[PDB]
Scaffold this active site. Structure first.
Site, PDB file in Angstrom:
ATOM      1  N   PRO A  95      -4.194  -6.990  -3.747  1.00 24.13           N
ATOM      2  CA  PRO A  95      -5.030  -5.798  -3.904  1.00 24.13           C
ATOM      3  C   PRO A  95      -4.197  -4.550  -3.604  1.00 24.13           C
ATOM      4  O   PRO A  95      -3.213  -4.616  -2.860  1.00 24.13           O
ATOM      5  CB  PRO A  95      -6.101  -5.988  -2.826  1.00 24.13           C
ATOM      6  CG  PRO A  95      -6.239  -7.462  -2.730  1.00 24.13           C
ATOM      7  CD  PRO A  95      -4.812  -7.950  -2.814  1.00 24.13           C
ATOM      8  N   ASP A  96      -4.584  -3.425  -4.199  1.00 21.62           N
ATOM      9  CA  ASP A  96      -3.899  -2.152  -3.978  1.00 21.62           C
ATOM     10  C   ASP A  96      -2.397  -2.191  -4.272  1.00 21.62           C
ATOM     11  O   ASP A  96      -1.584  -1.657  -3.511  1.00 21.62           O
ATOM     12  CB  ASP A  96      -4.152  -1.665  -2.541  1.00 21.62           C
ATOM     13  CG  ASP A  96      -3.710  -0.222  -2.316  1.00 21.62           C
ATOM     14  OD1 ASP A  96      -3.892   0.619  -3.221  1.00 21.62           O
ATOM     15  OD2 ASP A  96      -3.185   0.075  -1.227  1.00 21.62           O
ATOM     16  N   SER A  97      -2.024  -2.835  -5.371  1.00 25.52           N
ATOM     17  CA  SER A  97      -0.618  -2.897  -5.743  1.00 25.52           C
ATOM     18  C   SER A  97      -0.379  -2.219  -7.086  1.00 25.52           C
ATOM     19  O   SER A  97      -0.041  -1.038  -7.125  1.00 25.52           O
ATOM     20  CB  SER A  97      -0.101  -4.340  -5.753  1.00 25.52           C
ATOM     21  OG  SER A  97      -0.836  -5.163  -6.637  1.00 25.52           O
ATOM     22  N   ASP A 157       0.836  -1.205   0.000  1.00 26.65           N
ATOM     23  CA  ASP A 157       0.000   0.000   0.000  1.00 26.65           C
ATOM     24  C   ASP A 157       0.873   1.258   0.000  1.00 26.65           C
ATOM     25  O   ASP A 157       0.738   2.119   0.870  1.00 26.65           O
ATOM     26  CB  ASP A 157      -0.914   0.006   1.231  1.00 26.65           C
ATOM     27  CG  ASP A 157      -1.619  -1.323   1.450  1.00 26.65           C
ATOM     28  OD1 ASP A 157      -2.562  -1.644   0.698  1.00 26.65           O
ATOM     29  OD2 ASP A 157      -1.232  -2.052   2.384  1.00 26.65           O
ATOM     30  N   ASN A 216      -1.631   1.430  -8.152  1.00 25.04           N
ATOM     31  CA  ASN A 216      -0.846   2.580  -7.695  1.00 25.04           C
ATOM     32  C   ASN A 216       0.234   2.965  -8.699  1.00 25.04           C
ATOM     33  O   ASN A 216       0.705   4.100  -8.705  1.00 25.04           O
ATOM     34  CB  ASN A 216      -0.182   2.289  -6.352  1.00 25.04           C
ATOM     35  CG  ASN A 216      -1.177   2.144  -5.234  1.00 25.04           C
ATOM     36  OD1 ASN A 216      -1.800   3.119  -4.808  1.00 25.04           O
ATOM     37  ND2 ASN A 216      -1.326   0.921  -4.736  1.00 25.04           N
TER      38      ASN A 216
END
Ligand SMILES: *[C@@H]1O[C@H](CO)[C@@H](O)[C@H](O)[C@H]1NC(C)=O
Ligand SMILES: *[C@@H]1O[C@H](CO)[C@@H](O)[C@H](O)[C@H]1NC(C)=O
Ligand SMILES: *[C@H]1O[C@H](CO)[C@@H](O)[C@H](O)[C@@H]1O
Ligand SMILES: *[C@H]1O[C@H](CO)[C@@H](O)[C@H](O)[C@@H]1O
Ligand SMILES: *[C@H]1O[C@H](CO)[C@@H](O)[C@H](O)[C@@H]1O
Ligand SMILES: *[C@H]1O[C@H](CO)[C@@H](O)[C@H](O)[C@@H]1O
Ligand SMILES: *[C@H]1O[C@H](CO)[C@@H](O)[C@H](O)[C@@H]1O
Ligand SMILES: *[C@H]1O[C@H](CO)[C@@H](O)[C@H](O)[C@@H]1O
Ligand SMILES: *[C@H]1O[C@H](CO)[C@@H](O)[C@H](O)[C@@H]1O
EC number: 3.2.1.91
Length: 363
Positions: free
Chosen positions: A136-138, A91, A141
């Site tokens: 997730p959330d990699s 994150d 970004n």
């Protein structure tokens, strides 16, 4: 029956794990009464994904697969559902991260060991179809947050680690889905192509893995699947729901080398639309939400393999306590339910909210 062709959700029934069931029966039900607790008992039977957010969560994965083997040895036809989530410098754009590994302190090597550990378990349980959501959330970004130094510096590590995960977990009984954000993040017209390019590159760079079925959207988020009217907070974006999102990015992936990519979409907290989000970017314990469309492969859509519940409803997104470590200010916003416990901890008031606003209803 462990191996498959086409949609991995066809031919099996996703397993409703004992971990989440324990939380509901032991932490929620003892505090509910009548109609409410009977409805809560039903929620525990809806299959959701189990998150392997730390290395010490791996024994729990093996424990879950053991239960499934017995269930199947006992006439069941169940499949496991897990989330791989332990990237170093995890994150990168968040104000506070609970990730245990750091790139600076040999995080890449530690992550590979984590993947090696998961692989052994999957090879041990080759007899069970295992559905996985990858990090997730990699990668999302890397499409919009390269302006943030932590993300820019984590780019090479993210790509190296994801390549390792996807190649090492490329097994016959496995079905992987790379996380691809949601309509409010990558659905914007200007982000569609750059996103499609990256995902297609990851696929081709891993030598087009057989097990990599496609992408996962709306993970831990609240977007509607096929809402007919755009919520106020989506203003300016023609792609305001998940259906419009996958149908927009699907053909673009094909244009970039990844043909036959399919999708799964999280609807665990999408039942009430519009939500209580004052801004689309608000993600922490959002108020005015409810359990949504139940997990099913009969999606009535050409690209969606299945509706799923990835983020387990009731488990906290983060704490609202300012004197607490890992405190993220996004969890203190007017549209975030408070007071909220540590991330991953049971959040009773939030569970009751989801249960009350559920659609389909449980009550
Ligand atoms: C391709 O894989 C290598 C590891 O073999 C990795 O270092 C690199 O970052 C990957 N590139 C992309 C675009 O995924
Ligand atoms: C949205 O999807 C659900 C589940 O497939 C379906 O029951 C409903 O009719 C759909 N609504 C619209 C407007 O397409
Ligand atoms: C799925 O694939 C395996 C081999 O990869 C077969 O043994 C099985 O019968 C099914 O076709
Ligand atoms: C899981 O259970 C369902 C029943 O809804 C079956 O259709 C499936 O084959 C699997 O046994
Ligand atoms: C069953 O498992 C859940 C999840 O760890 C616990 O919260 C509960 O107390 C019980 O041990
Ligand atoms: C936790 O345990 C209760 C009581 O056995 C169930 O009703 C619930 O569905 C969950 O399994
Ligand atoms: C939740 O956890 C309690 C123990 O803390 C059990 O008694 C209950 O059956 C459920 O597993
Ligand atoms: C169920 O939830 C209540 C709060 O409404 C707690 O007091 C109880 O300990 C259990 O967690
Ligand atoms: C919900 O309904 C069930 C079935 O009657 C009860 O056992 C429970 O106490 C609650 O009222």
């Amino acid at each position: 029956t462990a191996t498959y062709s086409g949609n991995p959700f066809v031919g099996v029934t996703p397993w409703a794990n004992a971990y989440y069931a324990s939380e509901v029966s032991s932490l929620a039900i003892p505090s509910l009464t009548g109609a409410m607790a009977t409805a809560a008992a039903a929620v525990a039977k809806v299959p959701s994904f189990m998150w392997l957010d730390t290395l010490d969560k791996t024994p729990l994965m093996e424990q879950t697969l053991a239960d499934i083997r017995t269930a199947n040895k006992n006439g069941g036809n169940y499949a496991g559902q897990f989330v791989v989530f332990d990237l170093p410098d995890r994150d990168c754009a968040a104000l506070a991260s609970n990730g245990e590994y750091s790139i600076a302190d040999g995080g890449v090597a530690k992550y590979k060991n984590y993947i090696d550990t998961i692989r052994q378990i999957v090879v041990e349980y080759s007899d069970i179809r295992t559905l996985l959501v990858i990090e997730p959330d990699s990668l999302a970004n890397l499409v919009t947050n390269l302006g943030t130094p932590k993300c820019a510096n984590a780019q090479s590590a993210y790509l190296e680690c994801i390549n390792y995960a996807v190649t090492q977990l490329n097994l016959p009984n496995v079905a992987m889905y790379l996380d691809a954000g949601h309509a409010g993040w990558l659905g914007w017209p200007a982000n569609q192509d750059p996103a499609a390019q990256l995902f297609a590159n990851v696929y081709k760079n891993a030598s087009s893995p057989r097990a990599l079925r496609g992408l996962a959207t709306n993970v831990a988020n609240y977007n509607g699947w096929n809402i007919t009217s755009p919520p106020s907070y989506t203003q300016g974006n023609a792609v305001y729901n998940e259906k419009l999102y996958i149908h927009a990015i699907g053909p673009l992936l094909a244009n970039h080398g990844w043909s036959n990519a399919f999708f799964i979409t999280d609807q665990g907290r999408s039942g009430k639309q519009p939500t209580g989000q004052q801004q689309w970017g608000d993600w922490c314990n959002v108020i005015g939400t409810g359990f949504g469309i139940r997990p099913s492969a009969n999606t009535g859509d050409s690209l969606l393999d299945s509706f799923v519940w990835v983020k387990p409803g009731g488990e906290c997104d983060g704490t609202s306590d300012s004197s607490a470590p890992r405190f993220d200010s996004h969890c203190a916003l007017p549209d975030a339910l408070q007071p909220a416990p540590q991330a991953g901890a049971w959040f009773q008031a939030y569970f009751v909210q989801l249960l009350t606003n559920a659609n389909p209803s449980f009550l």
